[PDB]
């Protein structure tokens, strides 16, 4: 309850045949459904109105908290400051009018995933490469482990997603903040995500790197993501 935004310390060197990660050691994708105002006087009119996502401004919140090198981080050397958060990081966001659609891929198909996680069902050796059986909706917060799931480029017709993975022992975190940067969400046809049932879906994973305790134990550190989505009224044909 004190280390909100951290994982349980990382286990290492599990046999591929005996790999049973703790639930609290596994970062999961974040998701929220944002209710939007009803636009429709009625649902009988020839044309109806739907919210259309046009742009998103987004950034990671609290990046300067990593300038705390006094709280619990291993000294870099004798008399030195604490070790910065560093190592493998993943920065991902999606905006859609439907839940994010995901494809399952595993490091280890024999991993025994714990209760409270949703992971690829009936995994095979093919699950370590591409097994098209592993399709999920990001339909639950704090459930889909980041290590099991990626955004599915074969689907997500009504979602725009953006991710960067930087892997490595000592990878430096590099994070930008500005309220002047906008990502356009309109497709080739000039249409943004259309918000079905007056619902906007925001999804994120922001693993900033590993925190190192004085012992050498490592914990994932995550930070919140802000979304500001510009929406416009789009006329559609009444499907009823």
């Amino acid at each position, epitope marked *: *309850e*004190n*280390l909100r935004g*951290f994982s*349980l*310390k990382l*286990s290492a060197e599990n046999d591929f045949s005996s790999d*049973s990660p*703790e639930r*609290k050691m596994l970062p999961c994708y974040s998701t929220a459904r944002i209710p939007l105002p009803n636009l429709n006087e009625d649902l009988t009119s020839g044309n109806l109105l739907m919210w259309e996502a046009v742009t998103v401004q987004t950034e990671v919140i609290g990046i300067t908290s990593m300038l705390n090198l006094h709280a*619990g*981080s*291993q000294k870099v050397h004798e008399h030195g400051g604490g070790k910065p958060i560093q190592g493998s990081n993943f920065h991902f966001f999606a905006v859609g009018g439907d839940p994010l659609e995901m494809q399952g891929v595993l490091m280890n198909y024999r991993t*025994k995933y*714990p209760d409270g996680t949703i992971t690829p069902k009936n995994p095979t050796a093919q699950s370590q490469v591409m097994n098209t059986d592993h399709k999920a909706y990001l339909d639950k917060n704090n459930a889909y482990p980041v290590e099991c799931w990626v955004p599915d480029p074969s689907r997500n017709e009504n979602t725009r997603y953006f991710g960067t993975f930087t892997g490595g022992e000592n990878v430096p975190p590099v994070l930008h903040v500005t309220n002047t940067a906008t990502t356009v969400l309109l497709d080739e046809q000039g249409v943004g995500p259309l918000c079905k049932a007056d619902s906007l879906y925001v999804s994120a994973a922001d693993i900033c790197g590993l925190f190192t*305790n*004085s*012992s*050498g*134990t490592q914990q994932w550190r995550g930070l919140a993501r802000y979304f500001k989505i510009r929406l416009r009224k789009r006329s559609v044909k009444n499907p009823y």
Partner: antibody
Amino acid sequence: QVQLQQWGAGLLKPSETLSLTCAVYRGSFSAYYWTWFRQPPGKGLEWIGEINHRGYTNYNPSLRGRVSISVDTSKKQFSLKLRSVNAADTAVYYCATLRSTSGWHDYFDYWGQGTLVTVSS
Amino acid sequence: EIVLTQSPGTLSLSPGERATLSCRASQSVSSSYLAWYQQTPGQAPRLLIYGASSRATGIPDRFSGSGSGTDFTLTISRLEPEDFVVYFCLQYGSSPLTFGPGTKVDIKR
């Protein structure tokens, strides 16, 4: 792979002072809180107290006044002193660390082999 | 000091069965700072669970903990022969650290 090596006189006479030392190998001496426990024959465990590398101590009131814990950073050793021993101090004494200096979130399970301490004339 | 009580004193169960062990505190354990230890005769205590529900390095997944405040549970999902030994709870939410008096798990025959 932190290794705790425990030594000291296990056979004590009533009224004497118990003196035990724990040596730390294959681990950072400065990175952990160093703790003493005892387990009387066929009974549960008692927390005696703890120390860090800077010599900050906390003791159980249950044997307070009688107990001293010290560190030797040059030898990477910490010690237990228990004054005026009697039959009720008969126990297996364990040195251990339960957590790093980062705090209780960074929990550990390193134990010495234990010293059987018998108090008898 | 915080007093811990363990129930039952002796738990008699068969290999392969689910074991549920209880630890109750005289007052609320701060931050759910409750650890579970296994003790085999002639050995130091062995950590299973810390922070009420965190499994320790290298501990098999059949060991799990739950609870908060005053009420804590260790679950052994499927008892192996080596599991029929003594279990202690430790609270470290309050100084001094205090242990429960222990639960013995014995093979029901």
